């Protein structure tokens, strides 16, 4: 038993050794018996069961309201996360596991804020959306019943470089030189507060007009920040989906670009939209950085959609990768297809669920195992994708503590990205045992006082040592042979200490503390990897570098986060391997690359799909016999009778059935990410 060899000194020290250690506070315990070891072995010494101090960690569910089935109802009833609050109690170095459920409730309210670029290039676009309010309402009516629409516009900071300032007529009509009239330049103007009277959208849009700026890049991000943080002005509903449609056809200014204009004050992320609906700090505050934009988007639960023209889709595709939770769509030069763009983007947003952690204590660590559709379990992954509206997914979370912290109560939140609903975890630590409540300092129970009696042996103060503190510091008589050596022939305290009255006292230490009845244990001599010693993601006790819950290995040099193993298509290691320490290890021949995606010699792509079409056409196949084929048939299936050869990348493939007939089918995928295949109705 590890507990006997390291603790035994006191109740608190015993329980901190390991989760399974137990302490006996019964004074009737036989003299010389081990006072600290696992309960089942301890009880054999007839220690009073009521006097045993063996706390056990637990997770208790406080608020658990069932997941809702429909978004149409009351604000306080809709529930997409369950349980909603959980009480967690942990021992000094123990861990507990709990679960969570997430549902993409159908018919949930939606808020759409249309943030439009109004440079002179978008004059054609402003004409196309003159009836978008009615058309958008009709299309969204089949997805939600509580739609709300708002509008806003931006050009760029109305300052030098960016603005025309000569002739003085150009200030009042930047299009003066083109013999045409356009509005004076503006940074960001809020037009329509999110409202359900969709007719107002048409009225407001019909009154807008474009402006003109000098340089090519625009000031969109500076407007995204204000559309995000000015919640009361914009009118975001907390219990609704927030879509921010950002439309533009040009490059964008970024942080530190404002220095050319004489603007050096960093963006503060506050709301500066005044009573006139104009962003007042436009000319005195720099553009926001991507980090601040991401932080503010996450806090307000806003999904940002980049609806941009093809000449800049690649740029915003790369920007979107640095702002997780955002979508990009190709906008027509006329903005005629923005409605379908919005509708498609909304489907993509609700097809994915990803968890998020807030205010996690530094001493804690979490590991997730996601249970996506069809009971698929992906260890280490905290997100699913490919969902439909109304689907349910579940996760399993395990929390571990890096030793007993000073604070006794702490809390953190687990929340899906873009959701208001969240799980609140209340963490408690019970490092100190109950018997300590009746400590008796300097009592007659302790030799000459000079100590404290608590839960058992007295805690000897200065000038005394040994059981009952009977031996003074000045005695150290050598007549004792009280087992003060790991094994005869080796020094009494392994040269790390000196034996006094039979108990070793460890001498100076380099950069830690020494422990053990032979001073054989310490917390600073652990193993090393490429000269780093313990990796720092874990404990270092008795020479062992012990890692957190999300780190592993004798050296704690191995991660468990799976982001680096995520393929571009969105499934783990391209389905050809497992992540290990953040590096996919391929399990099928020929697969190589960072995510096992480079396989050149893998069989013909249609070969894999033939096994799926077997599942989706006929009652045969091992996967079908397993009933697991629905897991592997992620692709869309459509039946035909003549192969649709009208495709540039459609793979026409065939195979010989177990029956005499021949099977015909095709496959392809497009930029939208959808993967589809056609199957002939009847085999030939």
């Amino acid at each position: 038993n590890i507990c006997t060899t390291r603790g035994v000194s006191s109740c608190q020290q015993c329980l901190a050794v390991s989760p399974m250690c137990a302490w006996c506070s019964d004074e009737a315990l036989p003299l010389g018996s081990p006072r600290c070891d696992l309960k089942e072995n301890l009880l054999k010494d007839n220690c009073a069961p009521e006097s045993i101090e063996f706390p056990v960690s637990e997770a208790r569910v406080l608020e658990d309201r069932p997941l809702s089935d429909k978004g149409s109802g009351d604000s306080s009833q809709v529930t997409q996360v369950s349980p909603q609050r959980i009480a967690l109690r942990l021992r000094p170095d123990d861990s507990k596991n709990f679960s969570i459920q997430v549902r993409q409730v159908e018919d949930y309210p939606v808020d759409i804020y249309y943030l439009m670029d109004l440079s002179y290039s978008m004059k054609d676009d402003l004409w196309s959306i003159q009836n978008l309010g009615t058309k958008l309402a009709t299309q969204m009516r089949k997805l939600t019943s509580n739609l709300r629409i708002g509008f806003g516009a931006f050009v760029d900071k109305p300052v030098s470089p960016y603005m025309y300032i000569s002739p003085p007529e150009a200030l009042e009509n930047p299009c003066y030189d083109m013999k045409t009239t356009c509005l004076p330049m503006f940074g960001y103007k809020h037009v329509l507060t999110l409202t359900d009277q969709v007719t107002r959208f048409n009225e407001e849009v019909k009154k807008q007009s474009v402006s003109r700026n000098r340089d090519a890049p625009e000031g969109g991000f500076d407007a995204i920040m204000q559309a995000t943080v000015c919640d009361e002005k914009i009118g975001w509903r907390n219990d609704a989906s927030h879509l921010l449609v950002f439309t533009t056809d040009a490059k964008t200014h970024i942080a530190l670009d404002g220095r050319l204009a004489g603007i050096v004050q960093p963006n503060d992320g506050q709301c500066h939209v005044g009573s006139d609906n104009h962003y007042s700090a436009s000319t005195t505050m720099d553009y926001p950085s991507l980090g601040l934009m991401t932080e503010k988007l996450s806090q307000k639960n806003i999904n940002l959609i980049f609806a941009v023209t093809e000449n800049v889709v690649n740029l915003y595709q790369n920007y979107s990768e640095l702002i997780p939770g955002t979508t990009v769509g190709v906008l027509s030069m006329d903005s005629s297809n923005v409605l379908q763009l919005i509708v498609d983007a909304y489907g993509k947003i609700r097809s994915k669920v990803e968890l998020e952690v807030r205010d996690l204590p530094e001493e804690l660590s979490l590991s997730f195992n996601a249970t996506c559709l069809n009971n698929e379990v992906i260890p280490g992954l905290k997100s699913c994708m490919g969902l439909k509206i109304g689907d349910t997914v579940s996760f399993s979370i395990e929390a571990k503590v890096r030793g007993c912290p000073q604070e006794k109560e702490k809390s953190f939140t687990i929340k899906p990205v873009g959701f208001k609903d969240s799980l609140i975890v209340q963490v408690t630590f019970d490092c100190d045992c109950a018997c300590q409540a009746q400590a008796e300092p300097n009592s007659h129970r302790c030799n000459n006082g000079n100590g404290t009696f608590e839960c058992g042996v007295c805690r000897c103060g200065p000038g005394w040592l040994g059981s009952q503190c009977e031996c003074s510091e000045e005695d150290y008589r050598p007549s004792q042979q009280d087992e003060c050596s790991p094994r005869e022939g080796q020094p009494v305290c392994s040269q790390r200490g000196e034996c006094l009255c039979g108990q070793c006292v460890c001498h100076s230490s380099d950069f830690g503390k020494i422990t053990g009845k032979y001073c054989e244990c310490d917390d600073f001599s652990c193993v090393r990897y490429k000269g780093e010693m313990c990796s720092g993601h874990g404990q270092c006790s008795c020479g062992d570098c012990l890692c957190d819950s999300d780190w592993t290995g004798y050296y704690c040099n191995c991660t468990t986060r799976t982001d680096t193993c995520m393929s571009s298509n969105g499934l783990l290691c391209s389905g050809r391997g497992k992540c290990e320490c953040g590096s996919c290890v391929c399990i099928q021949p020929g697969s190589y690359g960072d995510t096992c995606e480079k396989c050149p010699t893998c069989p013909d792509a249609c070969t894999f799909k033939k096994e799926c079409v077997e599942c989706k056409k006929f009652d045969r196949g091992a996967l079908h016999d397993e009933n697991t084929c629905n897991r592997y048939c992620r692709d869309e299936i459509e039946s035909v009778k003549e192969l649709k050869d009208t495709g540039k990348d459609a793979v026409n493939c065939t195979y010989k059935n177990e029956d005499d007939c021949v099977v015909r089918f095709q496959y392809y995928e497009d930029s939208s990410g959808k993967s589809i295949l056609y199957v002939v109705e009847e085999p030939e």
Partner: protein, 916 residues
């Protein structure tokens, strides 16, 4: 680490004037005094009708911290004609950039607008003023006749400036040519001589300037920041400039030849919008005379634990090499949103250790966001990645982040004490602060105890005033101090000396000083800065045997020394500082005689043996290398015995074997010192007579030089014994091995073809693939998986070409990926279209491949057409085709010529079935 943070000199400017936006030193060669230059771009001035014209202030040192403006320009806006202003100086941000060199001062106004001489426009060309002693001349290279925004109209020349060694000015305008940016360089002599107040578009003869380029480069902001250094060895400073928006906003840094403005090198960022290039600096950081490039990316986002992106900032350090290539390493920030890397200021040799240093600012870090500055020291191997000091802003925000560290300047010894100093700007609160470098003293301590082995029966000396004889030993300690720069002749040191320092708490100490009776002794020593070591002696004696028990634990003699800085402070109160990387204490050990009994001295006989299971090692792999070492003493006890392991060029230590049962566990250690590297493990202090010890150590070894064929280990045992100090030396050898495991594999798409072919008919002459039949692709991959690479190899492809006088598959066109070149014995596509070879006539293809390393592979792509006419002939003949193809390879030469080569060969088989 030697910057004085306790009493810095603080300067203050007008409220709201951005005083401290740009800082620099002023060292006029004509005068002894030296000043600070501080730019206040928003300061109100006395010019007629000018609002927020900007100012440059000259602040002096060694006196009242008083700042006075420099009168670069006392006039207002000139008039092109009656009531038609030529220029608009209001809000011109004069002083946004300041530089000086000897007696020259150059300050610029990036936001200076002027009305061109051809229209009534208002264009920010930017202007600069150069003060050369008594003469002041305006310098506006971008105020030319190329007026529109497609020319130099919006240049904003002077956004960043610098001086070269040859008295050239480098000026950057990030707005030229639709914000492509521009660099302009002129000779200071030509600027002064060619000046004319009545000419607004002066032309300079020897000007160097970049030129407009394709529209794809618009909005790059070339010239956002500039630096100068030599990067081609001709002794003429070249131009380094940051382009933060280049390459899809990845950021770039251009290096231009300093003599004809031709491009030399380009650096590119790794993350978009990180603003790679916000700041740049060129300085030699490793003392090899080759300038090194530093590039800041304030908004860089890295991934922390759990992979979340956080905006910490990054600085890229590039060490120049004689070969013309740069060895680059990255350095990340420490706090989120602190914008680490905003400013980079070469400090020169801050501590006079022989290598230059550098400071990097995070103007929004620290408590709240008052700002922080990090100081990094340079080593012979490059920059030291751990900051040796941290400066913290002390002024809270008034209405804007203080931005302490947004601008810095160093490498000038303002107080002439021999160490360069530093200025930090805090334009957010309108302040500038000067940090002075403290002199650094290096102290060499000494401590020795001659009678190390104490015989408690060797009563030699007697206690003072008593008849008792005691065994006593001498303790001798010394001090030596030296340092560069202005330092006092004599340094006062206080020394505290402890006997039996391992005793703690109330435990009795076994040794005491003779003249006194305490176990501790303290002395004040006066050290003169010089090479001769100064020493002092004391006599210590063992306590009588009756008073103490422990005879085994060694007696530790401990010395620590302190320097009273208050006494050594110079006339201005600048205190010295001890060197950071030298210990303040030194220790020795004295051992009681553990009954060796031979002749009251101990004769040890140290011997060892070494062995391993890795009889051979491969070039590179998951090295499990290990060593099992035997150590024994066949003589009398050995004091402070320890095992030393020496390793060759490439090697590493993993630790002692922990899991094994019979394997003894030891507290081994690893250090590198005296241009050598070793593992050290204490075998026991002392090792007892006849002691036997067995231990095992884990290593890691990979080879890359190809220069040798085997790896070695040399071992030794050392002790403190009088005579048999060292053990006989032993060596261990392991041979290198080459294992370039390689495999050849292929696939066929489709795996089968079914006839009759839909939508096909026979034709007299085919012209397109569908006239011939369905397409077939055969693919092969040559891959290397083994620990070892190979430099060249060859592969063969055997492919049927005629059976029963029928063509079978028909070659169309090649495709490959890797370092090989191929050839075939028969024509490719002999007809101009836009069941193996053992029974059928064959076509053969040959290809030779170059170097394939571990995990690399080469792929051959062959796409062909199934001549379905021949297969209709087959169907008439009514047989079946399991049409087949095969390939093979052979490795021909390893890059490890020094090692024995072994033949590796294999083959693969592919097929494509054809059935009705």
């Amino acid at each position: 680490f030697n910057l004085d943070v306790d009493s810095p000199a603080e300067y203050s400017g007008p409220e709201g004037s951005y005083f401290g936006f740009a800082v620099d030193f002023f060292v006029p060669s004509a005068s002894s005094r030296m000043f600070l230059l501080v730019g206040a771009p928003k300061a109100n001035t006395t010019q007629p009708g000018i609002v927020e014209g900007g100012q440059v202030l000259k602040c002096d040192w060694s006196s009242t911290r008083r700042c006075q403006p420099i009168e670069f320009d006392a006039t207002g806006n000139r008039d092109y004609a009656k009531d038609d202003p030529l220029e608009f100086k209001s809000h011109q941000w004069f002083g946004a950039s300041v530089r000086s060199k000897q007696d020259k001062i150059l300050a610029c106004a990036p936001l200076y607008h002027w009305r061109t001489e051809m229209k009534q426009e208002r264009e920010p060309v930017g202007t600069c003023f150069l003060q050369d002693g008594t003469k002041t001349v305006e310098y506006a290279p971008c105020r030319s006749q190329d007026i529109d925004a497609d020319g130099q109209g919006f240049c904003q020349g002077g956004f960043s400036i610098d001086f070269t060694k040859a008295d050239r000015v480098l000026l950057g305008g990030p707005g030229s040519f639709y914000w492509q940016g521009q660099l302009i360089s002129d000779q200071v002599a030509e600027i002064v001589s060619k000046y004319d107040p009545n000419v607004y578009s002066i032309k300079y003869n020897n000007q160097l300037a970049t030129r407009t380029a394709q529209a794809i480069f618009d909005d790059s902001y070339l010239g956002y920041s500039v630096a100068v250094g030599d990067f081609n060895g001709d002794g003429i400073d070249d131009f380094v400039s940051g382009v933060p928006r280049a390459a899809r906003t990845l950021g770039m840094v251009y290096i231009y030849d300093g003599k004809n403005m031709s491009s030399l090198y380009n650096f590119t960022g790794e993350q978009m919008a990180a603003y790679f290039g916000f700041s740049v600096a060129a300085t030699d950081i490793n003392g090899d005379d080759y300038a090194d490039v530093f590039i800041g990316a304030p908004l860089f986002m890295d991934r922390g634990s759990d992979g979340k992106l956080q905006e910490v900032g990054q600085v890229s350090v590039s060490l120049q090499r004689a070969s013309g290539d740069f060895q680059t390493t990255k350095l990340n920030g420490f706090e989120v949103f602190a914008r680490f890397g905003s400013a980079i200021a070469p400090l020169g040799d801050l501590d006079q250790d022989g290598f230059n240093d550098i400071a990097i600012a995070a103007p929004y870090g620290g408590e709240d966001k008052k700002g922080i500055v990090y100081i990094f020291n340079g080593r012979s191997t490059g920059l030291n990645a751990v900051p040796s000091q941290i400066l913290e802003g002390q002024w809270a925000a008034r209405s804007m982040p203080p931005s302490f560290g947004y601008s810095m300047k160093g490498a000038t010894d303002i107080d002439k004490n021999g160490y360069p100093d530093l200025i930090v700007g805090a334009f957010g609160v309108d302040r500038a602060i000067l940090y002075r470098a403290r002199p650094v003293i290096t102290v060499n301590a000494g401590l020795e105890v001659y009678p190390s082995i104490l015989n408690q029966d060797n009563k030699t000396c007697s206690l003072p005033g008593t008849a008792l004889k005691v065994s006593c030993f001498n303790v001798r300690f010394c001090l030596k101090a030296d340092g560069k720069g202005v330092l006092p002749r004599k340094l006062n040191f206080q020394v505290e000396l402890l006997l039996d320092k391992l005793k703690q708490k109330g435990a009795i100490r076994r040794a005491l000083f003779l003249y006194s009776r305490s176990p501790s002794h303290s002395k004040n020593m006066t050290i003169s800065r010089g090479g001769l070591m100064q020493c002092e002696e004391l006599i210590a004696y063992l306590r009588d045997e009756s008073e103490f028990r422990d005879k085994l634990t060694p007696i530790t003699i401990f010395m620590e020394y302190r320097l009273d800085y208050r006494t050594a402070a110079d006339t201005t109160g600048l205190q010295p500082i001890l060197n950071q990387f030298t210990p303040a204490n030194i220790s020795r050990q004295a051992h009681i005689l553990l009954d060796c009994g031979e002749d009251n001295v101990c004769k040890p006989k140290l011997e060892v043996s070494v062995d391993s299971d890795q009889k051979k090692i491969y070039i590179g792999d998951d090295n499990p290398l290990t060593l099992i070492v035997k150590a024994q003493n066949q003589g009398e006890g050995a004091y402070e015995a320890e095992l030393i392991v020496s390793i060759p060029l490439q090697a590493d230590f993993i630790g002692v074997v922990r899991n094994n049962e019979a394997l003894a566990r030891l507290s081994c250690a690893f250090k590198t010192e005296n241009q050598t590297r070793q593992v050290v493990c204490d075998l026991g202090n002392p090792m007892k007579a006849g002691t036997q010890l067995l231990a095992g150590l884990r290593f890691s070894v990979h080879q890359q030089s190809e220069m040798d064929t085997s790896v070695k280990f040399d071992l030794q045992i050392q002790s403190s014994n009088l005579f048999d100090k060292v053990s006989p030396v032993v060596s261990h050898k392991v041979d290198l091995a080459v294992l370039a495991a390689v495999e050849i594999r292929g696939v066929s798409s489709p795996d089968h073809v079914f006839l009759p072919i839909p939508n096909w008919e026979h034709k007299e002459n085919p012209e397109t693939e569908e006239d011939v039949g369905p397409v077939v692709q055969h693919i092969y991959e040559l891959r290397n998986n083994g620990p070892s690479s190979f430099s060249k190899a060859m592969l063969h492809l055997q492919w049927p070409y005629k059976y029963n006088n029928n063509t079978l598959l028909y070659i169309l066109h090649y495709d490959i990926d890797g370092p090989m070149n191929c050839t075939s014995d028969m024509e490719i596509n002999p007809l101009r279209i836009k069941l193996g070879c053992g029974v059928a006539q064959c076509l053969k293809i040959v290809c030779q491949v170059g170097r394939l390393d571990r995990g690399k592979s080469a792929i051959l792509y062959v796409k062909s057409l199934l001549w379905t006419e021949t297969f209709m002939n087959k169907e008439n003949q009514n047989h079946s085709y399991s049409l087949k193809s095969s390939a093979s390879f052979n490795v021909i030469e390893f890059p490890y010529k020094n090692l024995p080569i072994e033949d590796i060969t294999n083959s693969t088989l592919v097929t494509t079935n054809v059935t009705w």
